[PDB]
Scaffold this active site. Structure first.
Site, mmCIF file in Angstrom:
data_model
loop_
_atom_site.group_PDB
_atom_site.id
_atom_site.type_symbol
_atom_site.label_atom_id
_atom_site.label_comp_id
_atom_site.label_asym_id
_atom_site.label_seq_id
_atom_site.Cartn_x
_atom_site.Cartn_y
_atom_site.Cartn_z
ATOM 1 N N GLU A 1 -2.025 3.518 -22.026
ATOM 2 C CA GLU A 1 -1.821 4.387 -20.940
ATOM 3 C C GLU A 1 -0.474 4.478 -20.623
ATOM 4 O OE1 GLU A 1 -2.647 6.522 -19.130
ATOM 5 O OE2 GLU A 1 -4.154 5.699 -17.853
ATOM 6 N N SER B 1 2.892 -6.371 -10.358
ATOM 7 C CA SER B 1 2.499 -7.955 -10.612
ATOM 8 C C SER B 1 1.557 -8.032 -11.890
ATOM 9 C CB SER B 1 1.499 -8.610 -9.443
ATOM 10 O OG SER B 1 2.300 -8.828 -8.403
ATOM 11 N N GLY B 2 1.476 -9.271 -12.495
ATOM 12 C CA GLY B 2 0.822 -9.354 -13.734
ATOM 13 C C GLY B 2 1.350 -9.080 -15.144
ATOM 14 N N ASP C 1 0.774 -19.092 -11.694
ATOM 15 C CA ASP C 1 0.315 -17.850 -11.472
ATOM 16 C C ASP C 1 0.292 -17.151 -12.892
ATOM 17 O OD1 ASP C 1 -0.661 -15.483 -10.207
ATOM 18 O OD2 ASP C 1 1.351 -14.938 -9.583
ATOM 19 N N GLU D 1 -5.127 6.728 -24.459
ATOM 20 C CA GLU D 1 -6.123 5.544 -23.895
ATOM 21 C C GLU D 1 -7.312 4.771 -24.471
ATOM 22 O OE1 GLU D 1 -5.605 8.649 -22.949
ATOM 23 O OE2 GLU D 1 -4.846 8.727 -20.484
ATOM 24 N N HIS E 1 -2.970 -14.160 -9.234
ATOM 25 C CA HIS E 1 -3.101 -13.695 -8.029
ATOM 26 C C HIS E 1 -3.769 -11.992 -8.145
ATOM 27 C CE1 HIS E 1 -1.298 -11.948 -3.789
ATOM 28 N NE2 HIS E 1 -2.603 -12.827 -3.699
ATOM 29 N N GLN F 1 -3.491 11.733 -15.309
ATOM 30 C CA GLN F 1 -3.732 12.654 -16.293
ATOM 31 C C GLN F 1 -4.213 11.875 -17.438
ATOM 32 O OE1 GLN F 1 -0.136 14.914 -16.246
ATOM 33 N NE2 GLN F 1 -1.249 16.587 -14.992
ATOM 34 N N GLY G 1 1.833 -3.855 -7.233
ATOM 35 C CA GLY G 1 1.364 -3.266 -8.395
ATOM 36 C C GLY G 1 1.955 -3.476 -9.535
ATOM 37 N N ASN H 1 0.130 7.911 -18.112
ATOM 38 C CA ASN H 1 0.121 8.684 -16.887
ATOM 39 C C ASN H 1 -1.228 8.416 -16.259
ATOM 40 O OD1 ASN H 1 -0.147 10.610 -14.579
ATOM 41 N ND2 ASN H 1 1.259 11.774 -15.708
HETATM 42 C C1 LIG Z 1 3.251 -8.213 -7.272
HETATM 43 O O1 LIG Z 1 2.708 -6.998 -7.491
HETATM 44 C C2 LIG Z 1 3.971 -8.625 -6.241
HETATM 45 C C3 LIG Z 1 5.410 -7.844 -6.055
HETATM 46 C C4 LIG Z 1 5.909 -7.829 -7.545
HETATM 47 C C5 LIG Z 1 3.054 -8.567 -5.055
HETATM 48 C C6 LIG Z 1 1.727 -9.144 -4.797
HETATM 49 N N1 LIG Z 1 0.738 -8.625 -5.969
HETATM 50 S S1 LIG Z 1 0.075 -7.211 -5.392
HETATM 51 O O2 LIG Z 1 0.554 -6.587 -4.489
HETATM 52 O O3 LIG Z 1 -0.138 -6.497 -6.736
HETATM 53 C C7 LIG Z 1 -1.604 -7.774 -5.494
HETATM 54 C C8 LIG Z 1 -2.631 -7.461 -6.463
HETATM 55 C C9 LIG Z 1 -3.933 -8.111 -6.355
HETATM 56 C C10 LIG Z 1 -4.386 -8.932 -5.293
HETATM 57 N N2 LIG Z 1 -5.583 -9.492 -5.085
HETATM 58 O O4 LIG Z 1 -6.419 -9.095 -6.097
HETATM 59 O O5 LIG Z 1 -5.823 -10.330 -4.131
HETATM 60 C C11 LIG Z 1 -3.358 -9.355 -4.533
HETATM 61 C C12 LIG Z 1 -2.085 -8.675 -4.364
HETATM 62 C C13 LIG Z 1 3.884 -9.143 -3.921
HETATM 63 O O6 LIG Z 1 4.662 -10.324 -4.183
HETATM 64 O O7 LIG Z 1 3.724 -8.926 -2.783
HETATM 65 CA CA LIG Z 2 -3.511 8.784 -18.672
#
Ligand SMILES: *C(=O)[C@@H](CC)[C@@H](CNS(=O)(=O)c1ccc([N+](=O)[O-])cc1)C(=O)O
Ligand SMILES: [Ca+2]
Length: 240
Positions: free
Chosen positions: A59, A188-189, A93, A69, A45, A64, A186, A61
């Site tokens: 990475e 996620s992944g 996912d 990095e 996602h 900064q 943020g 910070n």
């Molecule tokens: C992940 O961060 C989860 C909560 C742990 C959420 C969804 N992901 S996101 O908000 O990082 C995101 C990133 C990138 C995309 N995109 O490229 O479509 C979409 C969402 C959550 O469950 O809300």
């Molecule tokens: Ca940095």
């Protein structure tokens, strides 16, 4: 990460920041795990939008210069062929990113160790989530990498009616749910690191939280179960 603590600089060297080009600056959007010198494991996602992406390894910070990095472009994106953006609850996912250049390994940049295929953790197993995601529901990203202790919640409990019900599958790992600590947008992944036989291994890829908020009682953070995808991962890396 809600309810986290700042990680030490060299604790989680396989963690990466996945960023997209915005004007003539870059913005963090997701985490990932370095699994080969030229391959990153992240969530599908995270790459649903057709943006220009880069990976930052070493990475700590985001705002900064840390002096550690390495910045590398993303050359190829391979999403699991069964992924569907309209059904995150269906699973699958996971995505692999081939890097334009192989990164150099050091104490800030290392490969993540993955579990053996089929491994399932016992209920309440010790794990940590890491990331630069929101520090509060409807908040803002963290500047420094955060970590939070999130014990696993097994499938039988996690898929019960008062938790996630049918939304959670056996292809996923649940962790946390105490109402205080959790992943958030943020994160996620990125990785879920769990201690097994004395070694931390990456058992989850952060996938989702409740629509109600990040830290919600009985709505543990949900992750793709890495040990269900070992053959897929090896098949992609070997045919690219
Ligand atoms: C992940 O961060 C989860 C909560 C742990 C959420 C969804 N992901 S996101 O908000 O990082 C995101 C990133 C990138 C995309 N995109 O490229 O479509 C979409 C969402 C959550 O469950 O809300
Ligand atoms: Ca940095």
């Amino acid at each position: 990460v809600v309810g986290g603590t700042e990680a030490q600089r060299n604790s989680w060297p396989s963690q990466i920041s996945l960023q997209y080009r915005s004007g003539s600056s870059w913005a963090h959007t997701c985490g990932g795990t370095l699994i080969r010198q030229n391959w990153v494991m992240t969530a599908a996602h995270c790459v649903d939008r057709e943006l220009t992406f880069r990976v930052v390894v070493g990475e700590h910070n985001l705002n900064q210069n840390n002096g550690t990095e390495q910045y590398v472009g993303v050359q190829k994106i391979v999403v699991h062929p069964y992924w569907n953006t309209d059904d995150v609850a269906a699973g699958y996912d996971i995505a692999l990113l081939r890097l334009a250049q192989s990164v150099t390994l050091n104490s800030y940049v290392q490969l993540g160790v993955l579990p053996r295929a089929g491994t399932i953790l016992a209920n309440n197993s010790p794990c940590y989530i890491t990331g630069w995601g929101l520090t509060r529901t409807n908040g803002q990203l963290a500047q420094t990498l955060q970590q939070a202790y999130l014990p696993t919640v097994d499938y039988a409990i996690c898929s019960s009616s008062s938790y996630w019900g049918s939304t959670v599958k056996n292809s996923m790992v649940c962790a946390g749910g105490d109402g205080v600590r959790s992943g958030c947008q943020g994160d996620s992944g990125g990785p879920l690191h769990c201690l097994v036989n004395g070694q931390y291994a990456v058992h989850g890829v952060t996938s989702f939280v409740s629509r109600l908020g990040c830290n919600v009682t009985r709505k543990p953070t949900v992750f793709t179960r890495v040990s269900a995808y070992i053959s897929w991962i090896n098949n992609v890396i070997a045919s690219n």
